[PDB]
Amino acid sequence: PPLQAVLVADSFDRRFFPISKDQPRVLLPLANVALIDYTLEFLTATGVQETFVFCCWKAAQIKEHLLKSKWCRPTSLNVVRIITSELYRSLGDVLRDVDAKALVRSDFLLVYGDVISNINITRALEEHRLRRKLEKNVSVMTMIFKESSPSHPTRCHEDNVVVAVDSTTNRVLHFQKTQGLRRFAFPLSLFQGSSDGVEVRYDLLDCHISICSPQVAQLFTDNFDYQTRDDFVRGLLVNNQIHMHVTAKEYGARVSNLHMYSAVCADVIRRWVYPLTPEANFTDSTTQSCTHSRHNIYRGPEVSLGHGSILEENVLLGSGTVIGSNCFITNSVIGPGCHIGDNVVLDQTYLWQGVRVAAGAQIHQSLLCDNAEVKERVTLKPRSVLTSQVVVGPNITLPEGSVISLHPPDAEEDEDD
Amino acid sequence: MEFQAVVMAVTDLTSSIPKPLLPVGNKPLIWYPLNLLERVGFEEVIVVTTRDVQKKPDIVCIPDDADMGTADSLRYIYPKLKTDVLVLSCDLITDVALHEVVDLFRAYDASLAMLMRKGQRDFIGVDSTGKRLLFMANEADLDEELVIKGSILQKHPRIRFHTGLVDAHLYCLKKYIVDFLMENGSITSIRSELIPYLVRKQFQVRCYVHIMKEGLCSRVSTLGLYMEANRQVPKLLSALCPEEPPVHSSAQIVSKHLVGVDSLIGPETQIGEKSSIKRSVIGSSCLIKDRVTITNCLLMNSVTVEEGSNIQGSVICNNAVIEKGADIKDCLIGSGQRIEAKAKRVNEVIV
Amino acid sequence: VPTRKDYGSKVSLFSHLPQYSRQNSLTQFMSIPSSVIHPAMVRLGLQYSQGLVSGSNARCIALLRALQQVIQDYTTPPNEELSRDLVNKLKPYMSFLTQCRPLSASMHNAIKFLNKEITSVGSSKREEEAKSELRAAIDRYVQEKIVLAAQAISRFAYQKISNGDVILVYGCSSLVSRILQEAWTEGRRFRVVVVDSRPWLEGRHTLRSLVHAGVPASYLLIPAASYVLPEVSKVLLGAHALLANGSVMSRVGTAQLALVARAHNVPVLVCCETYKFCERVQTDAFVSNELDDPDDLQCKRGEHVALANWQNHASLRLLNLVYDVTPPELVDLVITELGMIPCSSVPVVLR
Amino acid sequence: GSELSERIESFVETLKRGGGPRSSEEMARETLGLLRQIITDHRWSNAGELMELIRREGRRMTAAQPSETTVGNMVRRVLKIIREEYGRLHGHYAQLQSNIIEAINELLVELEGTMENIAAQALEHIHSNEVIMTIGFSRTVEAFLKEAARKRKFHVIVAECAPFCQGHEMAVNLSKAGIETTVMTDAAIFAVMSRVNKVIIGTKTILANGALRAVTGTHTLALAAKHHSTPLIVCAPMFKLSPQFPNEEDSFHKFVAPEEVLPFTEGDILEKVSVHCPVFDYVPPELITLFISNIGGNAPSYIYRLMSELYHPDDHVL
């Protein structure tokens, strides 16, 4: 059967809500490229021949962005179908609707709209199909993981997880998240059933990719209280069975906060998601052409950086990004059309399209959204966010936890300097 | 001396004869750990049995005034020991080369190294390499299901859990462990109390384990393990002591009517006419006098048959006499019991 | 103690050298309480065979620490002289240690120095004073030739590290990493490029240490050095042994990195103490070397191992070289505790 | 024509994602087949607009993967042979199809037989009881050694590549025929250079001056061979030769993900470290002694004279 996937282009949580009032999370650029573009490229490369897009919040912008992409073309292979509705507001509400409309007929892949990965799912496909054929369709979902050290910056505390898995058949017997927990509790139900190869694993990174079967849609329809995949796995492991697949040589991660954003951007810039590198141009557009150099230097067309400026390490330059003199840029991604002043340093920052930086500014570990503006003699401490063309006053330093936007109750006051 | 060997010789209906002296494979039970200690270095060994045991190295026997825990017994013999002690159980029959756990004790400078075998109630945490000990708890000890500290998982993300492992009570202890036991007298029964203490304190103190899945590693503690160990002895005794023939001792009045395959017969146990001993260990001074069919059975010593009996899957204590043609199947006959010609059920008749 | 057995077919050009396996050990046919070999020596050999201690300096430190235990526990037999009997008795221990792992040049120098010191034990001196003096002499030798001799080398290499320089180091050398760590905190702001090669992959050991020290780091494999060398301004390498003719014996990848850097006109400097200078002279990499376990060559590239079963093929042999020498013309500066003598006139100064 | 567009796009994405098939000769033959197919399934009147169309296709093709020069070389060959067909007829528009098709078929048929001709020179070069080194996996060199060993006995020492141990496969393949192979790491090259009589390795792309674009570590091997004055022999098919000059900027070597060199499970140290994994390296022609091809032994300086016969100078820049 032709492989198909279900793509959810909406995260039903307020974890990106100094920003998401303007554009959805799936449209946020990771490295000059939208988040949903990476997921679509991964789905196309992994062998999926048809995808369904379920967008509820700001569906018009998502549809407009998708229709002009390379994935909507007569020559494309992974045909996309955009389904927009304001009724559903949860993953369960979408999985119980995909069953009602009978869109899925075989083993499909359930993946969010902000997953950055290059994992080949063919081996997982074969393992899941063999398990279902041999066990009279007992397994219902194979969740893709990735072995990594717990101290890696990619593993955040919010998305941390620990499992108790039988090593013989790599089937999940317990699933819980470690959020503010110093000790972990494991029941004795799994030990009694099989005492051969029970193993507790804490070195697995939640890739958030889970290939499923229409039985999962039927179960989600049956249980109205189910809203999230975590709820489904908790309800299934208490009362069918769930297996996993462990990846060791391929990259995979889903962004959910600024920490995940920074980690994924750093990994992508350092070519950890090859061949999905900025210079590869996996999306066929003329405004994202780059050129790779030593120490991972990416330069767009017509940059024209000023004299005396040094690009130290892992910097992406957009198309038409004017750079001043005596600059110092390292570990930062700058979008197209930006104007950079003089004697200005950038360390682990992220500048989107349209930002202007005056001379003398010092920005470290910050994020600037579209059309933002920074005046002279302004110092930005780490973990500061400027959104939607907001401006700051000259000779003013922002504290560490200083998020500034034009919305009164969310963050600090408007752009009026 | 690099090591100091200690054996702790301090479940019913067969304890009239002392438990360390239980005849297993026509040999004393205490002979097996002693032989395991022997023929690999170990010219000396300390033994802490009671008076009833009257037990090659010159074994040092220390009588015990009253029953006490094994940890208390170890604390009692502190002046005798002067280095790292190797603690062994009184009733334990293995074929493993002792160097497997001694290498873990030596190379890693481990504070404790112990041996168990896979089964053929207790949860043991095993590192991915299969040697380091991480978790150890008994099911009845903790009311909560299973608690694992996050700190011990941060450094060891992968932990393998087993439930069927059987403890061999083969412990390699460092010198300061005995001092700690002396200054902390509340600790008793090292197997149940001290061992978990040294596991939770690592997260320096290190503990390693050598999991076995090929050997026997029998630890007789109940009647069920007693019968199983005897039937596996004949293969072991062939390699351990090839000098003594497995068939019979030289001073024997056996009938010479064959009917013996893979069966050990003790000294001067006269056999009558056309008997049948199939995979059974006959004791010492057993007067067999007729066509008796004995299959997979144990007779301690001085057990006499009279006229054409059937013996199947049973244990008989010493000084027991059967009468005429009784048929025996899956039974236990006490020491001195006189059972006439009848069919005996599973019931374990005792004196 | 029997001689250690071989493992697998050996290379035709490396027939003379011995090649042992890591999984098997020489302690299988040994008494559990060691009597032929001192228990400290047994522990040292077991650690050496498993690769627990592999540093050139750490191996010598551990060997001398074990020799301290051997000296302390030694007792003079009647009508015997300590100065000669100790030397005679120490030979079997080192013979046993040789089987576990081939000895390094620094080990040979330490052995020669200790033998010379033991030979000079006076007849009038009794056991206690002679043993205490020997232990104090060993400790003083360690202090003044191991930890104190590194301070001078680091302070000398301080002048050769200026602001803005990039240094390409190879392997896991304690002295080389210590130089960078001690020079980074004195004000110099440099960047280090860490280069290593499989199967040991020990460059991560110094890479992580440099990262934890705040020094910017770069990691890449040996074949990528030629690509990264144009930007490299200096090369720092550790020397396992200084030869009589000036050749620098070091890790297998050292002699090739200098050759590649010469074509790029990048200066190359090696730093080592003067106690690693061995009197033997030899210009090739074949007559004197050590063969490691060939099983480390195989890797799990993809889902299958290409060299999973290499012993089946009768014409395929795995070669795991360890050391090789570099010509004195390749390296233009040798840093020692006595100064900055050129590599050409190394023996004249070191004599 | 829709199937033609689907085929060209599919080949473009195949090049972009992962080079398939692995063998270079099979990929060149596939490029020839697809170029012939797009030749015979298009509408045109003159040669100029068809040349422009093929130029557009080739420009996209090498923009997908600049590191692969075989497709560009073969497109240049197609352009050159089309120019020959036009010149031999102009010195008059419809009859070009048959000439182009027959000439392309002849080129493909000759392309099938570029292995036996290269291997046939193994008897003259390789001798008995001589140590020969090869780095990485190269089908041409493997066939060379295997056919040379059919009548001679010698020792081959194969050095595995650093990121992908592809030398193990070559050593296993050679040892299956009884050649007495040997496997080491990349660091033993200078140590074993002492007794190595000759070095015979393959390459990926031959440049204008005779340089190489082989796998990583080739430059070090050539330098070590030159230091000990051991001759180095390069065997490569004709189509691998490219008119590209050695280097104009960076990215001459393709960079695969750093996961190959340093694994993800390292921990927090990955954030503060930069790890690079080159696949190819530059080899100056001064380190090359001889070249083996369908013609025979060619000096490294004698590499340019074939450019005029193979490629038209106007097509060098593409």
Author numbering:
A (entry chain A): 41 to 279, 285 to 462
B (entry chain I): 1 to 10, 17 to 61, 72 to 136, 155 to 237, 297 to 444
C (entry chain E): 167 to 517
D (entry chain D): 8 to 98, 125 to 351
Sentences from the paper on this structure:
The rate-determining step in this pathway is set by eIF2B, a heterodecameric guanine nucleotide exchange enzyme whose activity is determined by its conformational state and its assembly from subcomplexes. eIF2B promotes GTP loading of the trimeric GTPase eIF2 (composed of α-, β- and γ-subunits), enabling eIF2 to assemble with methionyl-initiator tRNA to form the rate-limiting translation initiation ternary complex (TC). Using hydrogen–deuterium exchange–mass spectrometry and cryo-electron microscopy, we identified a central α-helix whose orientation allosterically coordinates eIF2B conformation and assembly. Through comprehensive characterization of eIF2B remodeling events via HDX–MS, cryo-EM, biochemistry and cellular signaling experiments, we discovered that eIF2B allosteric coordination is mediated by a switch that is triggered both in A-state → I-state and tetramer → decamer transitions. This conformational switch is orchestrated by a highly conserved helix that is located at the core of the eIF2B decamer and facilitates the hinging motion that converts eIF2B from the A-state to the I-state.
The decameric complex can disassemble into two stable tetramers composed of subunits β, γ, δ and ε (herein referred to as ‘eIF2B tetramer’ or ‘eIF2Bβγδε’) and one dimer composed of two α-subunits (herein referred to as ‘eIF2Bα2’ or ‘α2 dimer’). eIF2B tetramers have reduced activity relative to fully assembled eIF2B decamers (later referred to as ‘eIF2B(αβγδε)2’ or ‘eIF2B decamers’). To explore conformational change and side chain interactions associated with the assembly reaction in the switch-helix, we determined a cryo-EM structure of the eIF2Bβγδε tetramer to a resolution of 3.1 Å. Overall, the architecture of the tetramer closely resembles that of the eIF2Bβγδε tetramer in the context of the eIF2B(αβγδε)2 decamer structure. A close look at the switch-helix elements revealed that the side chains in the eIF2Bβγδε tetramer adopt the I-state conformation, with δR517 forming a salt bridge with δE445 and the δF443 rotamer in the ‘up’ position, consistent with the increased protection seen in HDX–MS. In the tetramer, the amide protons in this helix exchange rapidly, suggesting that it is predominantly unfolded. Specifically, in the eIF2B tetramer, the δF443 rotamer is in the ‘up’ position, and δR517 is salt bridged to δE445 (step 1). Switch-helix conformation correlates with eIF2B activity; side chain arrangements are identical in low-activity tetramers and I-state decamers and switch to the opposite state in high-activity A-state decamers. Shown is one representative experiment from a total of three replicates. d, The eIF2B switch-helix is in the I-state orientation in the eIF2Bβγδε tetramer (1).
